[PDB]
Amino acid sequence: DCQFELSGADGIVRSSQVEQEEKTKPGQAVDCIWTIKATPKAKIYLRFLDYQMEHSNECKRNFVAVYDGSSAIENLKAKFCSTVANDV
Amino acid sequence: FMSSRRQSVLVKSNEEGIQRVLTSDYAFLMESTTIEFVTQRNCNLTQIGG
Ligand SMILES: *[C@@H]1O[C@H](CO)[C@@H](O[C@@H]2O[C@H](CO)[C@@H](O)[C@H](O)[C@H]2NC(C)=O)[C@H](O)[C@H]1NC(C)=O
Ligand SMILES: *[C@@H]1O[C@H](CO)[C@@H](O)[C@H](O)[C@H]1NC(C)=O
Ligand SMILES: *[C@@H]1O[C@H](CO)[C@@H](O)[C@H](O)[C@H]1NC(C)=O
């Protein structure tokens, strides 16, 4: 239940909270999904201020996917597990 | 560079290539017969290479 309900003009979702929000345990399978709500009449632009994978080019054990709406592959702009994540 | 930042640097006209140099810090790769026209009207732009 790693829920992260938030909105506003901006907001910085980090990998620091996933050990600090205490919904996880060190060394177990997570399904923690961040939820982004816009301000009314707005569009969303994810940019990466930091990006670092412990197993590069291995999209089985660590990745970051970007779903544009609900959990559907109909709206899946990009899915990164390489060294560099471009901005969507 | 330009493949990684395609939404940033690549523009949709020669007109937007002028404005990004007039406003931002930009090095627009224009064809050399409309560099020889814009630099005649705007004396604040130049052809910096060959
Ligand atoms: C002096 O040179 C600068 C270029 O460095 C001219 O352009 C300014 O550049 C900033 C960003 O680099 C932008 O806000 C505008 O394109 C320009 N600003 C202003 C206030 O003009 C600048 O015009 C030149 N002249 C003066 C008097 O500063
Ligand atoms: C966004 O702008 C409105 C006014 O246009 C302002 O009242 C509001 O505080 C701004 N948002 C934030 C998070 O400050
Ligand atoms: C180029 O920019 C500067 C700032 O105003 C000035 O020398 C000149 O007026 C500009 N060029 C034109 C054509 O306005």
Curated annotation (Swiss-Prot), chain A:
Designated name of the protein: Neuropilin and tolloid-like protein 2
Described purpose of this protein according to its UniProt entry: Accessory subunit of neuronal kainate-sensitive glutamate receptors, GRIK2 and GRIK3. Increases kainate-receptor channel activity, slowing the decay kinetics of the receptors, without affecting their expression at the cell surface, and increasing the open probability of the receptor channels. Modulates the agonist sensitivity of kainate receptors. Slows the decay of kainate receptor-mediated excitatory postsynaptic currents (EPSCs), thus directly influencing synaptic transmission.
Full-protein positions shown: 176 to 263 of 525
Disulphide bridges: 2-32, 59-81
Sequence ranges assigned to domain CUB in this UniProt record: 2-88
Cellular compartments annotated: Membrane
Quaternary structure and interacting proteins, as annotated: Interacts with GRIK2 and GRIK3, but neither with AMPA-nor with NMDA-sensitive glutamate receptors.
Organ and tissue specificity: Brain (at protein level).
Regions annotated as coiled coil: none
Swiss-Prot record, chain B:
Positions glycosylated per UniProt: 44
PTM info: Sumoylation mediates kainate receptor-mediated endocytosis and regulates synaptic transmission. Sumoylation is enhanced by PIAS3 and desumoylated by SENP1.
Subunit comment: Homotetramer and heterotetramer with GRIK5. Tetramers may be formed by the dimerization of dimers. Assembles into a kainate-gated homomeric channel that does not bind AMPA. Can form functional heteromeric receptors with GRIK4 and GRIK5. Can form functional heteromeric receptors with GRIK3. Interacts with DLG4. Interacts with NETO2. Interacts (via C-terminus) with KLHL17 (via kelch repeats); the interaction targets GRIK2 for degradation via ubiquitin-proteasome pathway.
Residues of the full protein shown: 708 to 757 of 908
Cellular compartment(s): Cell membrane; Postsynaptic cell membrane
Naturally occurring in which organism (per UniProt): Rattus norvegicus (Rat)
Highest taxon in the source lineage: Eukaryota
Misc note: The postsynaptic actions of Glu are mediated by a variety of receptors that are named according to their selective agonists. This receptor binds domoate > kainate > quisqualate > glutamate. It does not bind AMPA without coexpression with GRIK5.
Tissues in which the UniProt entry reports expression: Highest expression is found in the olfactory lobe, piriform cortex, dentate gyrus, hippocampus, granular cell layer of the cerebellum, and in caudate-putamen.
Role: Ionotropic glutamate receptor that functions as a cation-permeable ligand-gated ion channel, gated by L-glutamate and the glutamatergic agonist kainic acid. L-glutamate acts as an excitatory neurotransmitter at many synapses in the central nervous system. Binding of the excitatory neurotransmitter L-glutamate induces a conformation change, leading to the opening of the cation channel, and thereby converts the chemical signal to an electrical impulse. The receptor then desensitizes rapidly and enters a transient inactive state, characterized by the presence of bound agonist. Independent of its ionotropic glutamate receptor activity, acts as a thermoreceptor conferring sensitivity to cold temperatures. Functions in dorsal root ganglion neurons.
Phenotype for residue 44 to Q: Loss of glycosylation
Binding site for L-glutamate: 31
UniProt record similarity statement: Belongs to the glutamate-gated ion channel (TC 1.A.10.1) family. GRIK2 subfamily.
Name recorded for this polypeptide: Glutamate receptor ionotropic, kainate 2
